[PDB]
Amino acid sequence: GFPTELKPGTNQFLTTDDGVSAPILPNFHPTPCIHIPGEVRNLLELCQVETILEVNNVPTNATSLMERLRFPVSAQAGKGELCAVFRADPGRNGPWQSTLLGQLCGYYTQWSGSLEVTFMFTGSFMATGKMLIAYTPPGGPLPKDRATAMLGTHVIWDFGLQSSVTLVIPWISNTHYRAHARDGVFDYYTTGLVSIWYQTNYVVPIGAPNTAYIIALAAAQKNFTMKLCKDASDILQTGTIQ
């Protein structure tokens, strides 16, 4: 017959290979597809949806697991005190593991784009105050006071009729893409830090509670992309699933 030759790649089974295979049921026609609402074509649509960010991941008891979803605010002495700090790496361990964006980025090695964080104030109608939320680009240590924290990109938030404000973490990096960062050599890919400071105070009249809570929601922007699909770091199986 036709003379051929075999090359050093035969007889192997590559799991990511895409080819043709022999059908088992000939002349089989599947069931027609009716209209179903809510079809997803790309994962970035889900990556653009906000989810709750556990900034306050201190408690671990079963009864106190619901306390990780918010962090408090209260009246201070007026010195410009610090409220909370956290990192800006969605793929790293920490607060971002509770969002859908972090879980989806856990399957991809590299990412690129801008992020978005939204804080909602859940106090009484009679409470007022102002806050400073600052983002420190990589290379700078944890700010010691508000004077050093004001030198990065920041926003000043005033409580009022609109209960939420948004902080945008812009894309500032030397490389086009970032790999997943961790302690050691791979801390070359840090994104920076986010800090929350008191601007003036938390003022409240007579007859209203002295403590309120803040909910943080996180998502991605329209330039966010990922590549080089891999497997998730955590496997949810401790033995044989019977």
Partner: protein, 245 residues
């Protein structure tokens, strides 16, 4: 303009003066089944004004230590009025829904609620506490009726999934500082054009207080929560005897 609203369907009306717009789930409105999608041959019945109207189920009290509640649809309305009679007289069912949740307080109270709709909300068990016993939840927990059921582990949503990602579902918030109502519109969600109303539940409604309620002593300590719903574009087919179970 976006604060005041009125909802009129059938012979019932709802007026509110503190709102945060209306969410239309998955960007789609309820509608009737087309000829290409339909499979049964008998013509369905569309009673219209007698079944598409607002129903109120019950009132639940919000405490400083509440966990959360959940309801199952259309299991709540299988015993209420003409909708219940039609649902238990026919075999096939389809409809949309409109959900309105009400909770009001003063200007000195604080709190927050998350109201979400999750299709095919299957309930799991604690597996005896050690994962060794393969138990299943009783019929009371799976379909609690119109009285609802209270969550035991709200962090895992009683099903092993985090609550912090529940915002991916159609949802709103009730912040006592901003608004006092939440409105969601849901189309018919299923992989079949028609289904049984006594064996299948399309979705579930979750009300979980993320930020706890607080107030100073002397104010009103009773803060109720009320649920109002109305079917939209209801259809029935497969007439037979009346079965309740």
């Amino acid at each position: 303009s976006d604060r005041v609203a009125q909802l009129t369907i059938g012979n019932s009306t709802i007026t509110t003066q503190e709102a945060a717009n209306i969410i239309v789930g998955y960007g789609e409105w309820p509608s009737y089944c087309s000829d290409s999608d339909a499979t049964a041959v008998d013509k369905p019945t569309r009673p219209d004004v007698s079944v598409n109207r607002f129903y109120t189920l019950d009132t639940k009290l919000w405490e400083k230590s509440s966990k959360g509640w959940y309801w199952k649809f259309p299991d709540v309305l299988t015993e209420t009025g003409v909708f219940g009679q039609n649902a238990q007289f026919h075999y096939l069912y389809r409809s949309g829904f409109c959900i309105h949740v009400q909770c009001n307080a003063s200007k000195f109270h604080q709190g927050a609620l998350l109201v979400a709709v999750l299709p095919e909300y299957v309930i799991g068990t604690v597996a005896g506490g050690t994962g060794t016993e393969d138990s299943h939840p009783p019929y009371k927990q799976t379909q609690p009726g119109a009285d609802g059921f209270e969550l035991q582990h709200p962090y895992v949503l009683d099903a092993g999934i985090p609550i912090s990602q529940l915002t991916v579902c159609p949802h709103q918030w009730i912040n006592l500082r901003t608004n006092n109502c939440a409105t969601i519109i849901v189309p018919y969600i299923n992989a079949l054009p028609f289904d049984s109303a006594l064996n299948h539940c399309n979705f579930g409604l979750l009300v979980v207080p993320i930020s706890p309620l607080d107030y100073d002593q002397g104010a009103t300590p009773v803060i109720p929560i009320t649920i109002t719903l109305a079917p939209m574009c209801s259809e029935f087919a497969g007439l037979r005897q009346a079965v309740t179970q």
